[PDB]
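User: Can you write out an input/output pair for a complex, sequences first and structure second?

Assistant: Here is one pair. Inputs:
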Amino acid sequence: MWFGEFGGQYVPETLVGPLKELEKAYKRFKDDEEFNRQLNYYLKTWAGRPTPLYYAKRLTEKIGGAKIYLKREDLVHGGAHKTNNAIGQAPLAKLMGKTRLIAETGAGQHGVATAMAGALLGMKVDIYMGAEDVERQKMNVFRMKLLGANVIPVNSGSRTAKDAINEALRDWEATFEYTHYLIGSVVGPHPYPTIVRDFQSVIGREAKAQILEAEGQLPDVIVACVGGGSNAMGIFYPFVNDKKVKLVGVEAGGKGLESGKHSASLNAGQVGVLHGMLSYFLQGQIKPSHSIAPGLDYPGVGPEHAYLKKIQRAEYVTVTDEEALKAFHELSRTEGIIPALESAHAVAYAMKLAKEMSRDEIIIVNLSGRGDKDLDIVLKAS
Amino acid sequence: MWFGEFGGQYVPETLVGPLKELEKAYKRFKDDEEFNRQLNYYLKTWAGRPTPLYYAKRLTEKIGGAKIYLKREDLVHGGAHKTNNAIGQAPLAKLMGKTRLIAETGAGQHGVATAMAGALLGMKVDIYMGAEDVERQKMNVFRMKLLGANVIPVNSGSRTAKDAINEALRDWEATFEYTHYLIGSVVGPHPYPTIVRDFQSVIGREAKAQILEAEGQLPDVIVACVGGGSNAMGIFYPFVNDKKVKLVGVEAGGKGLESGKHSASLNAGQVGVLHGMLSYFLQDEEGQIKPSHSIAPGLDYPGVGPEHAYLKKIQRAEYVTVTDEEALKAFHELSRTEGIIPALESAHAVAYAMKLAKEMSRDEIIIVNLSGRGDKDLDIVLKASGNV
Ligand code: NA
Ligand code: NA
């Protein structure tokens, strides 16, 4: 329910029933042999798991310190770690007798991931998306329609992600009998933060096993970018108990901390209730965020990261638009891997951290996705 | 050098030393322990091999006939099988003491794959590309420059693939001391058709093991799309001695075979010489390579590998055509039905597999090589199909 004081289930009574039903359904299937046989089989044959753990040899020699490994989630079907979550939540919903999936999206990336999972399982999929987001993300919207999903633009208020979230809550409230709300990150009321993190944990369990095979030891640092925080928890969570591993989350520094134009909820937001959870967001009411990485452009952050920060298990830092962009070009030229701009934040801070560390130390960076979707954006910038 | 009567080494005398040195190095390293260790390590950690074999249940049942499995080359780093070849050849060139990679590309996908490999190995990369093809493929070209590669537009001839290949050939002739010419399909002068096939054979080796594991027997048919024939030879080759295994190569039918606007070299082409090989080519009454059309840019290659010409002669493999209309429907169909957006080249294979399974019985099996992912083609498909 909670992670320290963070988390919770602060929703209108109308949503309490649907949430307990989700929580009970999850408790039953989570460890179920048959449900896990279906999920591991989709992740293998359909999604491509396991993803490799890659030694960035040339980048490492260039900077001069720590060995840099990349967890290559960029190679997941769809090009983004979000697939892991969406393909876990979709079959679950079908086991509860749901014929429909809804979800909201800002950058369009969870939109794509959900439409894909829906196509696979033959469920209807409706995606809420602010009309201003729709215009900015022409290609993700087309991807969604290609996969057979309906994209409902929201043409009220600020016409942004905040307006789309609310419209999806009102929808689910009306249609939970047959509809599952497929939340995209480790946010929202219990049990979503836990469910999402459990479905992304596969990343860390593989990474863990892959670095023991390659180096004979656990890593010294694990770096990962943080929007809501699903890829970060995914890779962090199997190492939470291992005291020797530093966990570093990298939030979107945007145009700089002092400009207002960033998405550093943990580093600069205040605690509050939002989206049915107690955590950090930028604010009284939500204030707008910004990031060149569209997936990091979300006012809030996960309550389990809020917790890890409070108890100091994990450290959180920022990287600017300019820093991520240079790391986008760096990894491309030096390793032949074009990273998602979200992932480039992690890479950019890994590059800074490596410089100050010893040649015998080890950083693993969660390369949360590939850069193909971001080519237009980088072309306007450069 | 030969596959029956096709293949050969039809290049100026200047290129014969370079091609002997390449053949000598390949025979030295092909079975070398360390070379294969490093190659397999890259193919695993950098490219993401193995790729899974995926059962498309929903599609199979909708059609109501033979089983359809997709070999998921769309998941390889880069989005396409091409990477398998590029990461085979680039280290080989380095071990030969070369510091520069050059390459032809028409769709831009091979040039991207070449750029990625050169970036990894820290080699210079020059990509020759038809000026008309540069204009039609702005994101693949941006990808190449992002990767550190220089792109060199070709304004000679019809400014298409054919001309890029010749300019590539002319450059290598001058610079072969330091430059390896990274040929991107099972084409070119010997030893390239053999080499490229050998580096794509991994696909069929994985598929053979995976289908045995999944079904307890070999496939009844295997379907791959054919431009130059790289991905098809890759999946075909480890099954060629398995006599019962049908092999089907699907070529671009374009607007229709009777329209001339297509790219079906094996079905409608004549025997000729181009690119330093003897194989099948699309040409007119006066011998010149005719322009090739397909909605799938990677099947614009105006000829085909000599080994496919050989397999067609001895009727080991069958070769068919599929139209733009048909491939485009398969692209939509696979996206809705399996949530996998295929490359338009691969959608040719799927389209044929969908036609073939319907006629076959429910206990027969078809492996389709899903050669690439469709992200690169979305601008094309939105223009063709429309903004829904
Ligand atoms: Na945030
Ligand atoms: Na052809």
